[PDB]
Amino acid sequence: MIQRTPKIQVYSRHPAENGKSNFLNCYVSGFHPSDIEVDLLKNGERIEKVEHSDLSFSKDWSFYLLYYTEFTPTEKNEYACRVNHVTLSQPKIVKWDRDM
């Protein structure tokens, strides 16, 4: 058996087709087992309108999850990713660094 802690990256992107849109992205990588809970948070509250989630695996071993949604960042709001996994003793919260 193997278990691996997820690596978590939070960042923003503009689709080149559009430019108008800004997307908040949580990239959760290299984890095992695949059981996982992932949420985007605004000011601490769960964002239930998350339009996109892509899951893949490399070898039979490690899993990769891209979780993202459109958003409009202001200075007044905090955005974060929350991840719970069997390898974590407590949910991990990773805050969005505003120029990433």
Author numbering: 0 to 99
In the authors' words:
The D76N mutant is strongly amyloidogenic and, in contrast to the wt protein, aggregates efficiently and abundantly without seeding and under native conditions. Indeed, the 76 position is located in a solvent exposed loop between β-strands E and F. A detailed analysis of the interaction energies of the ensembles reveals that D76 is at the center of a network of stabilizing electrostatic interactions that are lost in the D76N mutant.
To better compare these data with crystallographic data, the crystal structures of wt and D76N were determined from diffraction data collected at room temperature (RT) rather than at 100 K. The RT structures are highly comparable in terms of conformation and B factors with structures from frozen crystals. Although D76N β2m rapidly converts into non-soluble oligomers and amyloid fibrils in solution, the intrinsic dynamics of both wt and mutant forms of the protein can be studied in the crystals using solid-state NMR (ssNMR). While this is in principle not surprising, as loops may feature significant mobility also in the presence of crystal packing, it is intriguing to observe that the fitted order parameters are consistently lower in D76N than in wt β2m, reflecting an increase in flexibility upon mutation. However, in D76N, major changes are clearly observed in the EF-loop, as well as for the residues at the end of the A-strand. In the case of residues 75–76 in D76N, 15N R1ρ rates were so large for low spin-lock fields that the signals disappeared within the shortest relaxation delay, indicating extensive exchange contribution for these two residues. A second mode affects the EF-loop and remote residues at the end of the A-strand, and produces a clear experimental signature only for D76N β2m. Mutation of D76 to N weakens a number of interactions with charged residues. In particular a salt-bridge with K41 is lost and the interaction with the R97 side chain that mediates an interaction between the C- and the N-termini of the protein disappears. Enhanced aggregation propensity in D76N appears to be correlated with the existence of a high-energy state characterized by a loss of structure in the protective edge β-strands.
